Amino acid sequence: PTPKYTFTERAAAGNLSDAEILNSNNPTGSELPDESDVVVGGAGIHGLIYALHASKYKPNNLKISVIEKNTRPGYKIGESTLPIFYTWCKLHGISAAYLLRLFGLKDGLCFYFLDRENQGQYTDFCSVGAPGLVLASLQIERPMSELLFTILAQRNGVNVYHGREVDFKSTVVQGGGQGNKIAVSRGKYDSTPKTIDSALFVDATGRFRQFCSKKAPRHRFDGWNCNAFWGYFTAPKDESKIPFDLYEGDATNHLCFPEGWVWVIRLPSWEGSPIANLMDMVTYILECADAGVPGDELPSSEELARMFGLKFQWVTSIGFAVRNDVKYPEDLSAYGTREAEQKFNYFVQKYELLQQFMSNFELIENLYGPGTTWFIRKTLAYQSPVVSGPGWLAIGDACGFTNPLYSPGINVGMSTSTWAAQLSHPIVEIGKSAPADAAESSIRKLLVPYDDYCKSLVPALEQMNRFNYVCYRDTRLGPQVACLWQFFAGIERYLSDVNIETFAHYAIKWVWGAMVPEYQQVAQKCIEHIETVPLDERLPDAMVDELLAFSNRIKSAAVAADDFSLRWDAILRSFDRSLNFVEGKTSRDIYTRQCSGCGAWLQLRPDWKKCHSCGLLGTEPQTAVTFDPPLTAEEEALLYAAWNTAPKYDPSKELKLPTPTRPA
Numbered sequence: 001p002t003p004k005y006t007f008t009e010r011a012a013a014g015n016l017s018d019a020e021i022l023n024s025n026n027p028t029g030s031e032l033p034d035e036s037d038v039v040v041g042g043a044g045i046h047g048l049i050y051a052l053h054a055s056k057y058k059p060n061n062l063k064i065s066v067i068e069k070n071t072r073p074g075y076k077i078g079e080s081t082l083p084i085f086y087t088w089c090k091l092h093g094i095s096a097a098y099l100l101r102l103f104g105l106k107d108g109l110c111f112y113f114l115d116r117e118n119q120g121q122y123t124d125f126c127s128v129g130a131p132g133l134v135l136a137s138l139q140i141e142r143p144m145s146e147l148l149f150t151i152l153a154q155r156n157g158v159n160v161y162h163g164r165e166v167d168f169k170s171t172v173v174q175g176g177g178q179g180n181k182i183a184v185s186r187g188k189y190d191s192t193p194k195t196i197d198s199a200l201f202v203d204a205t206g207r208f209r210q211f212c213s214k215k216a217p218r219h220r221f222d223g224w225n226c227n228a229f230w231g232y233f234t235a236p237k238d239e240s241k242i243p244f245d246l247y248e249g250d251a252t253n254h255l256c257f258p259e260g261w262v263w264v265i266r267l268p269s270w271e272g273s274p275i276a277n278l279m280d281m282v283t284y285i286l287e288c289a290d291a292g293v294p295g296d297e298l299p300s301s302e303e304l305a306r307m308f309g310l311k312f313q314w315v316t317s318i319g320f321a322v323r324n325d326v327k328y329p330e331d332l333s334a335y336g337t338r339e340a341e342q343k344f345n346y347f348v349q350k351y352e353l354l355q356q357f358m359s360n361f362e363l364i365e366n367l368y369g370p371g372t373t374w375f376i377r378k379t380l381a382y383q384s385p386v387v388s389g390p391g392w393l394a395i396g397d398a399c400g401f402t403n404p405l406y407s408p409g410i411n412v413g414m415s416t417s418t419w420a421a422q423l424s425h426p427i428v429e430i431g432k433s434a435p436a437d438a439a440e441s442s443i444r445k446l447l448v449p450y451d452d453y454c455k456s457l458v459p460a461l462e463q464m465n466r467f468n469y470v471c472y473r474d475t476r477l478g479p480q481v482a483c484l485w486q487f488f489a490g491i492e493r494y495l496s497d498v499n500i501e502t503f504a505h506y507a508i509k510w511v512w513g514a515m516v517p518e519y520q521q522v523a524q525k526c527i528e529h530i531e532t533v534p535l536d537e538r539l540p541d542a543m544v545d546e547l548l549a550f551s552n553r554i555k556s557a558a559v560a561a562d563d564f565s566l567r568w569d570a571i572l573r574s575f576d577r578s579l580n581f582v583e584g585k586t587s588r589d590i591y592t593r594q595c596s597g598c599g600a601w602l603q604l605r606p607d608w609k610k611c612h613s614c615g616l617l618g619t620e621p622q623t624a625v626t627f628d629p630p631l632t633a634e635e636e637a638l639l640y641a642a643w644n645t646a647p648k649y650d651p652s653k654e655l656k657l658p659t660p661t662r663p664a
């Protein structure tokens with residue numbers, strides 16, 4: 001496909017603002033429709049996942065308008081995504097060769113556990129991702145992911161309006177046939193607000209809970225909560241001076257210690273690029289995805305920047321997520337002038353390994369505009385008690401949220417977005433096909449499982465978060481209990497069977513494994529013990545021994561009962577095939593490599609000979625995956641065959657669950 005510069009030229013020809021060039025790509029036009037079936041408040045990642053999944057699940061049925069107050073896709077924290085998210089992107093027609101032009105490659109979740117009382121001592125937990133011919137995971141810059149999903153939505157009959165705000169004071173939501181009158185303005189100053197007559201409102205306003213807060217007070221869990229403070233840094237090409245053995249920049253790296261943990265995410269940034277130019281680049285990438293352009297014939301990320309006049313740079317996202325019962329000294333003025341800056345730099349110098357690690361990185365000033373060198377957010381975890389009602393439902397952060405750890409926010413949260421999308425078709429049809437009282441009653445019944453799922457989802461994720469946090473107080477419990485149980489319970493069994501039709505049903509059965517009974521049994525034993533030890537104390541060695549022995553005894557039976565075949569010793573560097581801990585084990589599969597030219601991490605596969613980020617040619621043999629233990633040519637061929645394309649929808653197929661087999 002020859003690249004077109006439609007939006008760059010349209011914007012210049014009409015001196016269009018950012019919101020106007022974006023809204024000009026809507027199927028029904030740049031102005032709001034008088035009426036719609038569904039109105040989505042908020043075009044964060046979940047409002048757009050919802051709208052894309054709804055139109056894809058059943059096209060040409062619902063008229064959907066998404067209202068976003070930002071003039072263009074705004075900055076969001078929340079950058080690490082997981083295989084279920086990639087699978088969803090692939091099911092929606094965008095596979096890894098195209099996503100990797102926009103986003104960073106992610107291969108594995110890796111953990112380093114720092115000993116607080118013995119500074120310099122650490123242990124680790126290493127996992128891998130998948131071969132390039134199986135799948136990829138992604139580190140996403142959220143202004144870019146939200147642009148990608150906006151453009152894809154506009155190409156699939158969804159209208160997205162940036163620079164427009166739902167007025168939750170004058171908006172009317174009710175359970176009639178189309179009882180909703182959604183008031184949309186450009187802001188509080190706006191003299192001339194518009195109204196969209198509609199049947200269903202979707203609250204996708206994230207943690208702001210702009211609608212559902214009207215129906216119930218925000219709920220907090222017992223015990224400590226967390227605070228986060230973070231910034232953006234350079235991304236070194238040469239990672240060899242990182243003070244952790246066997247470190248890899250394309251993993252989502254976790255530096256873990258008694259008070260909490262640090263995330264480390266390497267990802268490309270498009271900041272500084274005009275929005276219209278970005279629309280042309282994204283549009284071009286979708287046309288290439290439609291045409292099936294091979295990876296080696298697709299322009300590299302840097303070449304796309306040259307073609308469309310973009311800014312491109314590699315950054316590392318680095319942040320603290322710590323407990324809010326941490327004691328800080330009163331005067332922190334030595335570590336900066338902002339609180340976020342102060343607590344970040346104060347915490348770095350509490351751990352020699354964190355200071356040696358951070359000395360590989362240079363702080364980036366104001367990457368997302370003024371005031372954005374440093375971020376802080378306090379009291380992270382919450383739940384919305386009411387997530388649906390006559391004429392409306394809520395999705396994503398609007399339902400609740402826990403913690404960055406294991407990235408439930410996007411990858412678990414999309415279970416609500418995609419289920420709500422599927423449920424939206426009968427909700428709207430019920431209201432168009434039955435009198436008001438019976439329609440309302442039938443819809444309420446239909447949503448009882450949605451309400452019940454949300455109600456128990458967040459507490460399960462909250463217990464999962466505490467489970468990991470308390471085990472991060474010890475360098476054996478963290479890797480051998482908490483991480484082990486999260487990967488065994490939460491690995492995505494039978495993901496290669498998921499299609500558009502089964503996606504929501506599969507996704508709500510996953511929950512990162514946090515519903516698995518044996519997982520909850522080990523988690524409750526650890527939390528019950530460790531929470532009785534004050535944070536500023538070391539765990540007694542006998543408590544670690546006992547929790548470790550308890551966890552391993554429950555583990556052996558639960559692993560024996562799993563009928564899913566997995567080369568566990570290839571995926572977890574520290575464990576054998578039966579998930580026994582192996583002191584000093586170093587062998588694992590190798591799926592990625594670092595470009596010698598630009599430093600970008602690449603997926604190994606024979607048809608990708610050039611770096612997807614800068615275009616530099618690898619010598620060819622580098623593209624050979626290392627399977628350890630080995631796979632024959634037949635086994636390797638069989639693996640890739642399973643992951644080529646998703647199975648067609650069979651309404652007589654039983655859904656195979658991601659969680660381990662029950663013990664009968």
Ligand SMILES: Cc1cc2nc3c(=O)[nH]c(=O)nc-3n(C[C@H](O)[C@H](O)[C@H](O)COP(=O)(O)OP(=O)(O)OC[C@H]3O[C@@H](n4cnc5c(N)ncnc54)[C@H](O)[C@@H]3O)c2cc1C
Binds near residue numbers: 043076165380404
């Ligand atoms: C420190 C931290 C780290 C995290 N790391 C990760 C991670 O690595 N991986 C992960 O998956 N998750 C992570 N999360 C969670 C993740 O950030 C969220 O789950 C995710 O962004 C939720 O997206 P959303 O679409 O629900 O809401 P948001 O992305 O917050 O979008 C809400 C939207 O609503 C719009 N809006 C608000 N009011 C109005 C109105 N009146 N009219 C119109 N529009 C409106 C806003 O402009 C905004 O765009 C992290 C969270 C935190 C706090």
Ligand SMILES: CC1(C)c2[nH]c3ccccc3c2C[C@@]23CN4CCC[C@]4(C[C@@H]12)C(=O)N3
Binds near residue numbers: 128491495639
């Ligand atoms: C299931 C999968 C998405 C996964 N989910 C994880 C969670 C935590 C840590 C590691 C993983 C992995 C690695 C896996 C294991 N599978 C072996 C055959 C196909 C596949 C898919 C992939 C593979 O190639 N790598």
Ligand SMILES: CC1(C)c2[nH]c3ccccc3c2C[C@@]23CN4CCC[C@]4(C[C@@H]12)C(=O)N3
Binds near residue numbers: 504508651654655
């Ligand atoms: C299992 C089932 C009760 C179910 N449980 C859910 C939970 C959340 C969201 C959706 C579902 C569904 C829809 C299902 C999926 N199954 C495919 C084969 C038979 C069946 C039974 C039924 C079917 O026809 N529809």
Ligand SMILES: [Cl-]
Binds near residue numbers: 406407
């Ligand atoms: Cl993650």
Ligand SMILES: [Zn+2]
Binds near residue numbers: 599
């Ligand atoms: Zn390169």
